[PDB]
RNA sequence: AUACCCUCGA
């Protein structure tokens, strides 16, 4: 065994140790005799023998001496496999710099010499000298000299100045670094300079120097004086048929390097002139650079082809970018594929398998069984029987297939559900038969899809297939507890048609003694499928745990509902099946049955539902005909009216009265209203388009029109599509996004004109083009999500912490978006839950909330609860099994070893393909309550609230808040806390239209410095619209009026100076430009009076932005520290708003440029959490100021809005898991034990602080600040280098690991995947634990 | 910050300019002057002259060919007369080994116009540099011995010892200087003296002293440096020709720089085998060698 | 300097206030430095390179469609024109821009 | 039995 794969620089001595010879000849194989030549790229002396256990001459052919090397044949006789491990070396006449440590964005060789990459490139390209060992001379070691400059320096000095050129000079510089002295000097000079940029550069210098010192790495090794050569089979020449040979790019590059090296030696040995020698050295540097990588500087090309050569960097990068196609993809055996086909006679656990595919896949199993039964003696006979397809081979094939599950997956597997185990059944054909109910999970229709089939071999593999990924096990979606193996289109249609009702039908009225009599009457044809009848039933209810009570009851229902209830298992009431059985109702029924009865009865119920749905959709000859699309009669009248209106509006525009810009909006609004009215009329006609006779007088009933059934049942189609099918198509958008001024009046039944078809083509082309980019972005996003959240696996059971996130129902707006029940279902409680009256414990502790608990919480008036979240659970290297709540694919709590991180990433990324103001008006009646409001009462009781943080809530009678609204600054509210307000009332009468400035104090104000023409302007509007004064702009004012700002000095009614609480200075708010101060100076202004009034995306890109924690073009400016805010000096061009908190004055405040509008009013509480200027928030400021839980709530809500817009439901556990993975790193402020500023894992800092507490001193513990990293940045910054190297930027991370000397302990999922070990999660957890037991404990 | 290597090759080479054919004649005259100087230096080494007499004896005994020994002057019968004269000069110089110095100067004058095949040139160079290597090795041996054992100071080392290396005068003088280091030297008298006996044997083989051999080898080195400088000037002149001719074979399955470097090697070979008395332009002869080099390079890569 | 503020801005005049290029040789050598960086430029070499890139029947050509469309877009009655860019063609494109 | 290019399906 082994562990902890290391990475470091290759020493010339260790490079020699690796090699088995010195490659010296460029050519590979002689054209006359086809054996590799001496000292060539395939020489037998170096790389090994061509034929296993053979030599060059054949002197020794026996298989006995496997290590002896013959006398005439120096090529040691050994196995042919050895050509894969044996490498050689090339001795270069001069050293050449390594391309990776040169051209990486932070140049390691440049950083180690404190000289810019440009200067090093000048030296390497033989353009300028560099100075080595300055000695006692004016020249410095870092000084570069030109030809004339160097000649002058040599003439002036003569000696004591070693100046060189090329990579030889760089090598001479590197080995004279004296890393100890440089580290000491740079550490001494690190705190001397207070510049942030310089301190950052010297900190990076320190990091590199300490990495080199600790890692046992030598700086001179960066410039390789000797380079290896790949073993011949890893750079093979695959002979083309016809005697041609196909040479790999590696062979071409190696040949080029060898040729240039041989040229170098034989031109230095004859003392060629300096210019040509330096040109040859440059060529050798370029050739080695092209061998190592390409396109960085030179972009070398091949012969007679514009395609660049493939270097080793591109080889290790793999295909598909950096996603290793050989170490992660790894085409497998015992596999096949074919087109899929629906099999309606299949049970949920089994799938059809063609005879030939099954016979080919299970061939070794068939051979084994044939030999065991003795029917075949030699394997040749077994092959003859299996190829003859003798009748007895089908019996043994059936025996090997009986209990051997197989794996089926679609091409894009967006989640674990995309590959499930099926117990194959032999079928006659070439297509793979699929169960209809698993198509939804696979997202696989039968329009040409193909599926790959894989045969697990080991008993471990078969048991994992049967116990974890058998199709019956995964009924519920891992993304949300809602079922995924649910009736789809056709079976939903059948079940819906069965459970309908007709006003008058054959067989209506009589009573049936049992469901059996109902079936007997229906099959005999004496009763309609949907006829209102009476039937008594024997339902067994599971109301009490462990006690199944059966009761007999007579229910008024239909024949179809009674028939379908005969399928329902024995734990559910009949009332669950007495409705119309729409798709959502059926899905909820399956979900309820799973959580009540079990799993086996649930799969039986699902199979029975599918069978009956198919049977009764076949019995009902439902069909689509031209008469089914019922065009409403009023559509013609509505269209004519709208055409008359648009003609009138066009005439008005021609008159010039109406502007084109307003006419566009008017006509689009008119046409949208007409389209909505037409659609409403069509739906109202279609839905009730049934007139029936009930023993005389005619009556109406729900329609039996086929298209209406297909919509209402939810089987297939939507109202938006019937809007096109039977109503006007409505407005359509031009490619620029502007809605075309004329709509499509015709529907698909009437047929569109040519122009309308062309517009619909605009729309359809836009959508179809968007689809492919949506798929690509979703794939990239889910790949990044998986690679950032893979190491997270449940390890502990209960971490022990009591921190979590306060979860409350999402009530953004007037309606409840998500009830509290759905948010905390399957979660775990973090603290006590209390009644409306305290001291009464409802939910004690971390009890996993289930259906019973959510019903209990709904019965009580619990509104806000705190639950344990993965962002909590401070356990190290994993997550506790509580803080990650109930598993979603299973009904119970998660089990140790569940890779919830990968499940989270798959859950978030799977539905990506589905992606792309004055006053408050209370909705319903409820007791109004205030939250986070800080305002004093007005003179008359207006209660104007100037605080920016504040909201208005209308709590229900029970106590839960039914609706909440954001109350803005300066809002007058008729405070009636505890007094119920009727629905539609306007309790708060805010009307900002401006930035009002409240006046918390009263008295006769003293507007000091109000200059009419310099600071203010008594400009009155027309018709005496305002008796006020307009403040003069700072630049529009005079030279002296530019610096003068109006100030309303705080005085009382008699002239007494007043000041705001907390600060001695008065609340004399300045009046800036564009102000509205109506109150006369010296007039008593009431408390809260308005003094100064100043007038003021979505889809996959948005969720990607949130998961990368990006900064938009204009981020929202937020307050830094809570306290007394000030005014920003606009003269300097950037507003500086100093903050003076009452608890402690901190004068530090940044300057915000006035390029973006700032809506901040001075003289109020800063409220660090609050916002200073509008705009989309920058995830960071929220994290570093509001906290972690606040950032968690904001990010979760932001992602969930995007997902809920398309109606896809995803549990928040997954988003919180990804958030935990991103917040995994923290930066340190005052270390005492580490570097000043460093990005270290929070686990590392926590461990260091815990050890320091019980250690040398007590102050050794470090203080740190949490930092947020994007997924593409958090994934590349992992401690393991193998995980990052196979994600992205392989070169950068590999060079960083090389210089840093990183070690990778294979303790993640991808590490064990690439190295071929058992996964540290799932069933490999036991193996990993035993390995840890045997390793750590001796 | 151009990254194109061809571009910087053009920049660095573009400083030098061409020259008319009289300039080529002058450069070839410089080459001839250097080789004449080094050959005249070789004349002051009796072993080399005896070796050229032996090669002539092989010529007469048909052990060597006319084209494998001589390369003209500034038919074998003129060679007969010239080597008879040089042998008579050698014998008259050896007879009176004062006036012997004048006799060797006349010997160098007579052997000065002669020109020989490069193989014999490298043989003569190998002999003289081997004598130099022996002297230098004795220097290093004595130096490491005394410095690392007796701690005898480097100042008196580089003051009194040099240029004799053969007589007991320096050992005795250091012994009479009476430091403790001279007392420690007495343990190392035997090895140093027997190595100096070998040096004296080498000198008696060559009949010359250390200072004389140093003078001749220094003059030969100066002549070689002059010839090397002339060749450098000439090849830097013809770099333009080599790039111009290298244009023909770009897409021949080989890089441009490899082609021009092989053509450069060919043109240095051409310079090594170019004479001005042919009365021809250089380009005519350089084209053949450059074509040979480039074509062979491309043929090797098939 | 006949100009205005709201319309007719100094877009060219402001551009001409830079690059410190007075002689046509200075402009030619600057263009040679830009297009062929590194190699030291000579008068003849830079002039030849600029001429070849600008108005040579080889290494540059507008087809009949190209000339017709350029004339139509910049504004010209003649449909047919020279195959190479005219001296005043660049001035016309600058004016249109 | 290696790399590009083209076309096609989900
Ligand atoms: Mg499909």
PDB file of C-alpha atoms in Angstrom, chain A residues 416-544:
ATOM      1  CA  UNK A 416     -27.851   9.968  -9.177  1.00  0.00           C
ATOM      2  CA  UNK A 417     -31.353   9.094 -10.408  1.00  0.00           C
ATOM      3  CA  UNK A 418     -29.937   9.066 -13.944  1.00  0.00           C
ATOM      4  CA  UNK A 419     -28.478   5.600 -13.343  1.00  0.00           C
ATOM      5  CA  UNK A 420     -30.499   2.957 -11.503  1.00  0.00           C
ATOM      6  CA  UNK A 421     -30.283  -0.810 -11.127  1.00  0.00           C
ATOM      7  CA  UNK A 422     -32.829  -3.052 -12.845  1.00  0.00           C
ATOM      8  CA  UNK A 423     -33.331  -6.800 -12.623  1.00  0.00           C
ATOM      9  CA  UNK A 424     -33.215  -7.744 -16.306  1.00  0.00           C
ATOM     10  CA  UNK A 425     -35.774  -9.877 -18.106  1.00  0.00           C
ATOM     11  CA  UNK A 426     -34.989 -11.427 -21.481  1.00  0.00           C
ATOM     12  CA  UNK A 427     -36.990  -9.977 -24.379  1.00  0.00           C
ATOM     13  CA  UNK A 428     -37.126 -10.630 -28.116  1.00  0.00           C
ATOM     14  CA  UNK A 429     -35.616  -7.779 -30.098  1.00  0.00           C
ATOM     15  CA  UNK A 430     -32.734  -5.324 -30.118  1.00  0.00           C
ATOM     16  CA  UNK A 431     -34.094  -2.517 -27.912  1.00  0.00           C
ATOM     17  CA  UNK A 432     -33.935  -2.108 -24.137  1.00  0.00           C
ATOM     18  CA  UNK A 433     -37.411  -2.097 -22.605  1.00  0.00           C
ATOM     19  CA  UNK A 434     -37.901   0.498 -19.861  1.00  0.00           C
ATOM     20  CA  UNK A 435     -40.529   0.826 -17.173  1.00  0.00           C
ATOM     21  CA  UNK A 436     -42.783   3.804 -18.002  1.00  0.00           C
ATOM     22  CA  UNK A 437     -42.593   5.225 -14.477  1.00  0.00           C
ATOM     23  CA  UNK A 438     -38.795   5.591 -14.464  1.00  0.00           C
ATOM     24  CA  UNK A 439     -38.738   7.783 -17.591  1.00  0.00           C
ATOM     25  CA  UNK A 440     -39.449  10.902 -15.527  1.00  0.00           C
ATOM     26  CA  UNK A 441     -36.433  10.256 -13.292  1.00  0.00           C
ATOM     27  CA  UNK A 442     -34.269   9.557 -16.340  1.00  0.00           C
ATOM     28  CA  UNK A 443     -35.759  12.533 -18.223  1.00  0.00           C
ATOM     29  CA  UNK A 444     -35.965  10.061 -21.104  1.00  0.00           C
ATOM     30  CA  UNK A 445     -38.728   9.984 -23.683  1.00  0.00           C
ATOM     31  CA  UNK A 446     -38.925   7.327 -26.386  1.00  0.00           C
ATOM     32  CA  UNK A 447     -38.261   9.607 -29.370  1.00  0.00           C
ATOM     33  CA  UNK A 448     -34.879   8.015 -30.103  1.00  0.00           C
ATOM     34  CA  UNK A 449     -33.098   7.968 -26.759  1.00  0.00           C
ATOM     35  CA  UNK A 450     -30.390   5.399 -26.063  1.00  0.00           C
ATOM     36  CA  UNK A 451     -29.286   3.853 -22.782  1.00  0.00           C
ATOM     37  CA  UNK A 452     -26.019   2.281 -21.684  1.00  0.00           C
ATOM     38  CA  UNK A 453     -26.236  -0.991 -19.767  1.00  0.00           C
ATOM     39  CA  UNK A 454     -23.568  -2.129 -17.326  1.00  0.00           C
ATOM     40  CA  UNK A 455     -23.248  -5.466 -15.541  1.00  0.00           C
ATOM     41  CA  UNK A 456     -21.951  -5.383 -11.950  1.00  0.00           C
ATOM     42  CA  UNK A 457     -19.749  -8.374 -11.211  1.00  0.00           C
ATOM     43  CA  UNK A 458     -18.656  -8.591  -7.571  1.00  0.00           C
ATOM     44  CA  UNK A 459     -21.140  -9.671  -4.911  1.00  0.00           C
ATOM     45  CA  UNK A 460     -20.472  -6.273  -3.348  1.00  0.00           C
ATOM     46  CA  UNK A 461     -21.486  -4.637  -6.628  1.00  0.00           C
ATOM     47  CA  UNK A 462     -24.636  -6.746  -7.006  1.00  0.00           C
ATOM     48  CA  UNK A 463     -25.678  -6.094  -3.409  1.00  0.00           C
ATOM     49  CA  UNK A 464     -25.056  -2.362  -3.812  1.00  0.00           C
ATOM     50  CA  UNK A 465     -27.160  -2.408  -6.977  1.00  0.00           C
ATOM     51  CA  UNK A 466     -29.989  -4.246  -5.218  1.00  0.00           C
ATOM     52  CA  UNK A 467     -29.859  -2.350  -1.908  1.00  0.00           C
ATOM     53  CA  UNK A 468     -28.934   1.239  -2.825  1.00  0.00           C
ATOM     54  CA  UNK A 469     -29.693   1.822  -6.513  1.00  0.00           C
ATOM     55  CA  UNK A 470     -32.458  -0.679  -7.249  1.00  0.00           C
ATOM     56  CA  UNK A 471     -35.283   1.180  -8.959  1.00  0.00           C
ATOM     57  CA  UNK A 472     -37.678   0.542  -6.068  1.00  0.00           C
ATOM     58  CA  UNK A 473     -35.300   2.072  -3.507  1.00  0.00           C
ATOM     59  CA  UNK A 474     -35.186   5.504  -5.183  1.00  0.00           C
ATOM     60  CA  UNK A 475     -38.815   6.574  -5.448  1.00  0.00           C
ATOM     61  CA  UNK A 476     -38.390   9.960  -3.746  1.00  0.00           C
ATOM     62  CA  UNK A 477     -36.184  12.524  -5.443  1.00  0.00           C
ATOM     63  CA  UNK A 478     -32.914  13.280  -3.614  1.00  0.00           C
ATOM     64  CA  UNK A 479     -33.510  16.978  -4.325  1.00  0.00           C
ATOM     65  CA  UNK A 480     -36.853  17.012  -2.496  1.00  0.00           C
ATOM     66  CA  UNK A 481     -38.839  14.425  -0.576  1.00  0.00           C
ATOM     67  CA  UNK A 482     -41.555  14.549  -3.218  1.00  0.00           C
ATOM     68  CA  UNK A 483     -41.754  11.311  -5.239  1.00  0.00           C
ATOM     69  CA  UNK A 484     -40.131  11.007  -8.642  1.00  0.00           C
ATOM     70  CA  UNK A 485     -41.470   7.582  -9.724  1.00  0.00           C
ATOM     71  CA  UNK A 486     -44.964   8.949 -10.279  1.00  0.00           C
ATOM     72  CA  UNK A 487     -47.598   8.399 -12.994  1.00  0.00           C
ATOM     73  CA  UNK A 488     -46.642  10.281 -16.153  1.00  0.00           C
ATOM     74  CA  UNK A 489     -48.789  11.570 -19.032  1.00  0.00           C
ATOM     75  CA  UNK A 490     -50.702   8.517 -20.251  1.00  0.00           C
ATOM     76  CA  UNK A 491     -51.349   6.807 -16.912  1.00  0.00           C
ATOM     77  CA  UNK A 492     -52.321  10.162 -15.392  1.00  0.00           C
ATOM     78  CA  UNK A 493     -54.824  10.599 -18.230  1.00  0.00           C
ATOM     79  CA  UNK A 494     -56.231   7.138 -17.570  1.00  0.00           C
ATOM     80  CA  UNK A 495     -56.551   7.654 -13.818  1.00  0.00           C
ATOM     81  CA  UNK A 496     -58.132  11.074 -14.329  1.00  0.00           C
ATOM     82  CA  UNK A 497     -60.667   9.779 -16.846  1.00  0.00           C
ATOM     83  CA  UNK A 498     -61.548   6.861 -14.566  1.00  0.00           C
ATOM     84  CA  UNK A 499     -62.255   9.122 -11.578  1.00  0.00           C
ATOM     85  CA  UNK A 500     -64.524  11.679 -13.238  1.00  0.00           C
ATOM     86  CA  UNK A 501     -68.236  12.278 -12.759  1.00  0.00           C
ATOM     87  CA  UNK A 502     -71.093  12.657 -15.225  1.00  0.00           C
ATOM     88  CA  UNK A 503     -74.329  14.406 -14.294  1.00  0.00           C
ATOM     89  CA  UNK A 504     -76.381  11.660 -15.964  1.00  0.00           C
ATOM     90  CA  UNK A 505     -74.798   8.355 -16.964  1.00  0.00           C
ATOM     91  CA  UNK A 506     -75.757   4.719 -17.343  1.00  0.00           C
ATOM     92  CA  UNK A 507     -75.741   3.008 -13.968  1.00  0.00           C
ATOM     93  CA  UNK A 508     -76.259   6.134 -11.873  1.00  0.00           C
ATOM     94  CA  UNK A 509     -78.168   5.740  -8.628  1.00  0.00           C
ATOM     95  CA  UNK A 510     -77.990   2.181  -7.327  1.00  0.00           C
ATOM     96  CA  UNK A 511     -75.884   1.079  -4.368  1.00  0.00           C
ATOM     97  CA  UNK A 512     -73.155  -1.564  -4.416  1.00  0.00           C
ATOM     98  CA  UNK A 513     -72.340  -3.934  -1.565  1.00  0.00           C
ATOM     99  CA  UNK A 514     -68.597  -3.926  -2.317  1.00  0.00           C
ATOM    100  CA  UNK A 515     -65.951  -2.794  -4.775  1.00  0.00           C
ATOM    101  CA  UNK A 516     -66.265  -6.294  -6.227  1.00  0.00           C
ATOM    102  CA  UNK A 517     -69.902  -5.667  -7.133  1.00  0.00           C
ATOM    103  CA  UNK A 518     -68.887  -2.348  -8.703  1.00  0.00           C
ATOM    104  CA  UNK A 519     -66.323  -4.160 -10.859  1.00  0.00           C
ATOM    105  CA  UNK A 520     -68.875  -6.853 -11.709  1.00  0.00           C
ATOM    106  CA  UNK A 521     -71.436  -4.257 -12.800  1.00  0.00           C
ATOM    107  CA  UNK A 522     -68.932  -2.205 -14.804  1.00  0.00           C
ATOM    108  CA  UNK A 523     -67.359  -5.149 -16.637  1.00  0.00           C
ATOM    109  CA  UNK A 524     -70.826  -6.501 -17.424  1.00  0.00           C
ATOM    110  CA  UNK A 525     -71.531  -3.112 -19.010  1.00  0.00           C
ATOM    111  CA  UNK A 526     -74.470  -2.220 -16.757  1.00  0.00           C
ATOM    112  CA  UNK A 527     -72.805   0.880 -15.270  1.00  0.00           C
ATOM    113  CA  UNK A 528     -70.754   3.703 -16.747  1.00  0.00           C
ATOM    114  CA  UNK A 529     -67.160   4.187 -15.664  1.00  0.00           C
ATOM    115  CA  UNK A 530     -68.015   7.624 -14.214  1.00  0.00           C
ATOM    116  CA  UNK A 531     -71.544   7.508 -12.786  1.00  0.00           C
ATOM    117  CA  UNK A 532     -72.577   8.879  -9.403  1.00  0.00           C
ATOM    118  CA  UNK A 533     -73.310   5.762  -7.347  1.00  0.00           C
ATOM    119  CA  UNK A 534     -73.288   4.595  -3.734  1.00  0.00           C
ATOM    120  CA  UNK A 535     -70.976   1.870  -2.451  1.00  0.00           C
ATOM    121  CA  UNK A 536     -69.999   0.547   0.964  1.00  0.00           C
ATOM    122  CA  UNK A 537     -66.326  -0.184   1.558  1.00  0.00           C
ATOM    123  CA  UNK A 538     -63.962  -1.796   4.054  1.00  0.00           C
ATOM    124  CA  UNK A 539     -61.183   0.741   4.623  1.00  0.00           C
ATOM    125  CA  UNK A 540     -58.410   0.040   7.135  1.00  0.00           C
ATOM    126  CA  UNK A 541     -57.121   3.245   8.724  1.00  0.00           C
ATOM    127  CA  UNK A 542     -53.694   3.618  10.345  1.00  0.00           C
ATOM    128  CA  UNK A 543     -54.605   6.493  12.672  1.00  0.00           C
ATOM    129  CA  UNK A 544     -52.977   4.830  15.687  1.00  0.00           C
TER     130      UNK A 544
END
